[PDB]
């Protein structure tokens, strides 16, 4: 099932791209979250590609953009319990904006950004917002990307996309 597969990739990818402290906080959140995971084919190859490619993304985005603005505008840097559903809305609008066209590079950008949000949310332990972002990324993927993705060998497209 594609939605379940894509969900599992987000979790792994986030666990493999965080520092020590965040890795542990996220790993336990997921454990306690007690949610379903399948096995993704080529999963390891796909996660490696994503690390390389989100690396490409990060290195460029620190050149030409800053973070602080948007977290605030999202209401994510607060010690203040975050607005679950307001955040879905904006997230959804950002994805819709990101995805006016489809290709691998734009998909990469969705993982690199989701990472950035998740890591900022976790500074103050915003566990439910975090799980919310990951779930929304999963639905949206299943609603709008899956056909494009399956035309390109599925999630494994990333492996070749990246060389």
């Amino acid at each position: 099932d594609f939605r379940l597969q894509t969900s599992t990739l987000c979790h792994s990818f986030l666990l493999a791209s965080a520092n020590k402290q965040d890795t542990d906080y996220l790993t336990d959140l997921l454990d306690n979250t007690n949610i379903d995971l399948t096995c993704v084919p080529n999963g390891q190859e796909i996660i490696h590609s994503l690390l390389q490619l989100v690396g490409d993304f990060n290195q460029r985005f620190s050149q030409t953009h800053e973070i602080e603005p948007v977290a605030q505008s999202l209401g994510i840097d607060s010690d203040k319990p975050v607005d679950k559903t307001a955040l879905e809305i904006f997230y959804l609008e950002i994805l819709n904006g990101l995805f006016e066209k489809l290709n691998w590079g734009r998909i990469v950008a969705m993982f690199a950004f989701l990472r950035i949000l998740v890591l900022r949310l976790s500074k103050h332990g915003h566990s439910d917002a975090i799980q919310m972002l990951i779930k929304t990324t999963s639905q949206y993927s299943d609603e709008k990307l899956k056909n494009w993705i399956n035309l390109h060998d599925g999630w494994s497209g990333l492996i070749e996309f990246s060389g």
Binding site: F57, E93, G97, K101, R106
Partner: peptide, 24 residues
């Protein structure tokens, strides 16, 4: 819209990545 804008800033970086990785 406001957040839509964000998505396209993200989109340009995406398209740069996409271009570079084309087998060209």
């Amino acid at each position: 819209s406001t957040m839509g804008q964000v998505g396209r800033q993200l989109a340009i970086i995406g398209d740069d990545i996409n271009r570079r990785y084309d087998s060209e």
